[PDB]
A and B are shown apart, each in its own frame.
Chain A
Amino acid sequence: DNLWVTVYYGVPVWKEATTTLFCASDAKAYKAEVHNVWATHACVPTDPNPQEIVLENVTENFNMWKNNMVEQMHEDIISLWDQSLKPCVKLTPLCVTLNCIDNTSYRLTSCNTSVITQACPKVTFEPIPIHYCTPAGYAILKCNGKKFNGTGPCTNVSTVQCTHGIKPVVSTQLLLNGSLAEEDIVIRSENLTNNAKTIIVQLKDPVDINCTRPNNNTRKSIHIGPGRAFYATGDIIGDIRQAHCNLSRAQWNDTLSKIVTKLREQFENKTIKFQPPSGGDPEIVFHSFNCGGEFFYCNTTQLFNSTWTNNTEDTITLPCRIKQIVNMWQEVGKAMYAPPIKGKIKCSSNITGLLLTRDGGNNEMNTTEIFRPGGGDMRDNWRSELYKYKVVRIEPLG
């Protein structure tokens, strides 16, 4: 068990610290769930009595895209995927050194393809909310402003000892399970009008999504009689790598109608035109989430086609497809997996955020706004969660 002591009163000079934090999640330590196994060997139980000391008159410049704390979580989830889904073939590139003598030719074609073969057991998979807690001597601040602007200074700074519920869910084009906005859908981006930084859009209302596969692959009709030998029962008849999702159109249309109102105020009365993405990797062109080793690659072309104009006011069939050979977001290379499993898999998920890029240009005339879906950089996935916090070290005179 762990234990730390409070600070009754301290307002000294603040200095940005880069110390090593310890996780703290509510595990179980008995099930065969992987996140319960990982939290048992490296995490501690959650704080039963948290304390948030509110600072009346205190301000600070919370820069968020230069936060070194999200660089630690990104190196703590890569340590979980090497203990959760062991790939059958882990193909990764490996080059060494080839240069000539910038002034001399830079033809580097020496690269080795190292392959690793491991056992592939299909294991359970479900995220668990964790709490990152500060070590001895440091403190974690937290703004309470309902807008917070991204890298802008707030005024309602309060200090804590552990963060809120953070799930390690890995997804693209739609931020899954996590925290919601307070009062209004806000947008966050490091720099607008430079069309390189992704725009994080956080929602204030949870849009639900149900992703399941129908159990009709195996046949239940019996040809009891002349046949019953070749076409015998339990024979696969359907595609075992096909699924479908559903989105409540009457509820999702409200939340998207609030996103375009924020853009109009920000970008001075333009024609918001959403579009499908411009191509690339199948983890970028399509949606990508995980449910028990089932890596749903959901076609979202019937989700971002619609163009917009002013005066704005049921079951969208989202076609998904399970692909075995997937790209690894952690490092260059691929990872071939195992065949899918026997039974109904249901992903009764949430939608809390939205990752959007921007297509600006000067060849195109004065007014257009193209917002293609982006994401894929998993550091940007948890910058949408660790935006309120900051690790600062306060020296003690004692």
Chain B
Amino acid sequence: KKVVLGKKGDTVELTCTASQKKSIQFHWKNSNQIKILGNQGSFLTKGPSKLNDRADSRRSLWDQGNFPLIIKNLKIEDSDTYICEVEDQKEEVQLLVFGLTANSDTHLLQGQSLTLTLESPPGSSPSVQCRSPRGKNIQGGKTLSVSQLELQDSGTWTCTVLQNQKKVEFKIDIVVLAFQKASSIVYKKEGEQVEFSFPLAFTVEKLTGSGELWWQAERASSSKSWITFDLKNKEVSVKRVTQDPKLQMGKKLPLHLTLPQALPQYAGSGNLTLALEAKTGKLHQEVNLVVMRATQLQKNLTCEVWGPTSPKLMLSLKLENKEAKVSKREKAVWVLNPEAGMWQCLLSDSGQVLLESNIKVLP
């Protein structure tokens, strides 16, 4: 006997063999000896089973010698073996139906854990053999779970099941709600306006969104300053968050976390938490800001750099005609006895100047 596979809802073809070519009487019985279809002259008799409004047969092929068995809306409980009956013979066949789906429909954020749900029939030993466009042919038991699911792991994954040298393909609906950044670092100087931008990708749904941006100021342990904002449709509206930073937020989904002037106490790390629902879950993203303060105290000058600074960087203060008058690896470097010129401060990282600030000395 042979074996075929079902795809949980489609049609299946189960044919018999007959070499008489006389349109002789056929039957269709399961292992429990229950009639489903049968020949009556040239007529079709839907037998007394649980597949009354589902079983079908192609009458045009009856004068050939092939008698199919078309069953629509394949369920899991319909997995059984069927025997044919032509010219006093028993052509035994076999039938297996199974299914596979997820539980989270559209709320699959970037970095959210993946869950599967395999619906295999009892009395069978399946084997999950998936295929990913990133080359992940993950094999295992019946239930498979992956911790990683991002924007680059979306798409209809081809998960097939090998059992008795037979396999059929399937697809997986993945809607990925992700950001387009892990950590932004914005390099500004004292006085310059600071702009933050963290995008998303056009998802439309009902009441879903509310979140907030946490902040950790440099050397200021006075925490609990944030900004809380709500999300409902094309539109951005702050609920209410109040405090020292005059953070103005735009009205559209390209979020503009605007900061008026880069004061030196407004520097440090930060975390952007976004939370949607219908399937709850929380996104996270790192926010950083570096502030440079170049201001002469007296006829001698002094400059300093605030923010999440690296232990590998450089700092230089030069009068832009000659080379560097001082070069150190710190955050507060000073120059005594300067000269006339447009003094430049250089913040860099292994090759490339990040920040630049101009200042003049009158003598």
- A93-B40 contact, Cβ under 8 Å, with A359-B48, A361-B33: no
Say whether B45 contacts A281, CB under 8 Å. yes
Interface residues on B, range: 20 to 34
Measured CA separation A204–B148 after assembly (Å) = 80
A256 to B43, CA, bound (A): 27
Q: Is the CB of B64 within 8 A of A95?
A: yes
From the candidates B15, B35, B43, B45, name the one contacting A329 in the complex (CB within 8 A).
Answer: B43
Chain B residue numbers with a CB within 8 Å of A195 are 33, 35
**Which among B55-63, B184-192, B308-316, B340-348 touches the partner chain?**
B55-63
- B52 / chain A contacts, CB cutoff of 8 Å: 278-279
Given contacts A361-B33, A377-B25, contact A279 B41 (CB under 8 A): no
Within 8 A of B (CB), among A353-377: 359-363, 370, 372, 374-377
CA distance A359 to B25 in the complex (A): 17
B92 at the interface (CB under 8 A from A): no
The residue in B17, B66, B85 that gathers the most chain A C-beta atoms within 10 A of its C-beta is B66
| Cross-chain pairs A/B with CB under 8 angstroms, 26 sampled | A93-B60, A95-B61, A95-B64, A111-B61, A195-B35, A279-B46, A279-B52, A280-B45, A280-B46, A281-B43, A283-B43, A284-B44, A327-B43, A329-B42, A332-B60, A359-B35, A361-B32, A370-B48, A372-B48, A374-B45, A376-B40, A376-B45, A377-B25, A377-B40, A378-B41, A379-B41
**Does A331 sit within 8 A of B, measured CB to CB?**
yes
Q: In residues 296-339 of chain A, which contact B (Cβ within 8 Å)? A: 327-332
User: Across the interface, do A278 and B60 meet the contact criterion of CB distance under 8 Å?
Assistant: no
Residues of chain A in range 9-42 having any CB-CB distance to chain B below 8 Å = none
User: CA of A360 to CA of B17 in the docked complex: distance in angstroms?
Assistant: 25
Query: Closest chain B residue to A363 by CB distance?
Result: B32
| The 6 nearest A-B residue pairs measured at CB | A376-B40, A93-B60, A377-B41, A278-B48, A363-B32, A279-B46
Q: List the B side residues contacting A374 at CB < 8 Å.
A: 40, 45
Q: For residue A96, which residue of chain B has the nearest CB?
A: B64
> Contact partner of A111 among B17, B41, B47, B60, CB < 8 A?
B60
B38 on the A face (CB < 8 A): yes
Residues of chain B with a CB closer than 8 A to A361's CB: 32-34
Q: Which of B15, B42, B47 counts the most chain A CB atoms within 10 A?
A: B42
- By a CB distance below 8 angstroms, the chain A residues around B107 are none
The reply to whether the CB of B256 lies closer than 8 angstroms to some CB of chain A is no
Q: How many A-B residue pairs have CB under 8 A?
A: 86
Cβ contact within 8 Å between B32 and A362: yes
CB-defined contacts of A106 to chain B, threshold 8 Å = 15, 66
Is A196 part of the binding interface, using a Cβ–Cβ cutoff of 8 Å?
yes
Whether B46 lies near A278 (C-beta < 8 A) is yes
Contact indicator B63/A376 (Cβ below 8 Å): no
Verify if A232 is at the interface (C-beta below 8 Å from B): no
**Distance to closest chain B CB from A26 (angstroms):** 29
How many residues of A are counted as interface, with CB atoms below 8 angstroms from the partner's CB atoms?
34
A93 vs B60: C-alpha distance when bound (angstroms): 6
Q: Is A102 an interface residue (CB 8 A)?
A: yes
Residues of chain B contacted by A327 (CB below 8 angstroms): 42-43
A284 to B46, CA, bound (A): 10
Q: Is the CB of B63 within 8 A of A281?
A: no
Query: 1/0 per residue B15-56: CB within 8 Å of A?
Result: 101000001010100001111001111111111100010000
Closest to A331 in B: B42
**Which B residues touch A111, using CB under 8 A?**
60-61
Interface residue ranges of A46-103 to B (CB < 8 Å):
93, 95, 102
The smallest C-beta distance from A255 to any residue of chain B, in angstroms, reads 25
Q: In angstroms, how far is the closest chain A Cβ from the Cβ of B4?
A: 12
A108 within 8 A of B: yes
The answer for the CA separation of A362 and B63 in the assembled complex, in Å, is 33
Pairwise interchain contact A102-B17, C-beta atoms closer than 8 A: yes
Q: When chains A and B are docked, how far (Å) is the Cα of A95 from the Cα of B59?
A: 11
B33 close to A360 (CB less than 8 A): yes
The 0/1 profile, CB within 8 Å of B marked 1, for residues 257-280 of chain A is 000000000000000000001111
User: Contact between B34 and A329 (Cβ–Cβ < 8 Å)?
Assistant: no
Chain B residue nearest in CB terms to A113: B60
Measured in the bound complex, the distance between the Cα atoms of B42 and A378 in whole Å is 9
Docked Cα-Cα span, A360 to B33, in Å, equals 8
- Please name the residue on chain A nearest to B60 by beta carbon: A93
Q: Which residues of A contact B39 (CB under 8 A)?
A: 377
Q: Which chain A residues in 163-201 approach chain B with CB under 8 Å?
A: 195-196
CA distance A336 to B27 in the complex (A): 29
CB-contact partner of A328 in B17, B42, B46, B63, under 8 A: B42
Given contacts A332-B59, A360-B33, A361-B34, whether A278 and B47 have CB atoms under 8 Å apart is yes
Distance (Å) between the CB of B130 and the closest chain A CB? 27
| Contact (Cβ within 8 A) A280 B42 | no
Given contacts A95-B64, A108-B66, A279-B52, contact A196 B27 (CB under 8 A): yes
5 further contact pairs, Cβ within 8 A, besides A278-B45, A280-B44, A327-B42: A95-B63, A279-B46, A281-B44, A281-B45, A332-B59
* Contact partners of B85 in chain A: CB under 8 A: 196
Q: Which residues of A contact B17 (CB under 8 A)?
A: 102
Contact B45 A332 (CB under 8 A): no
- B63: nearest chain-A partner, CB-CB: A332
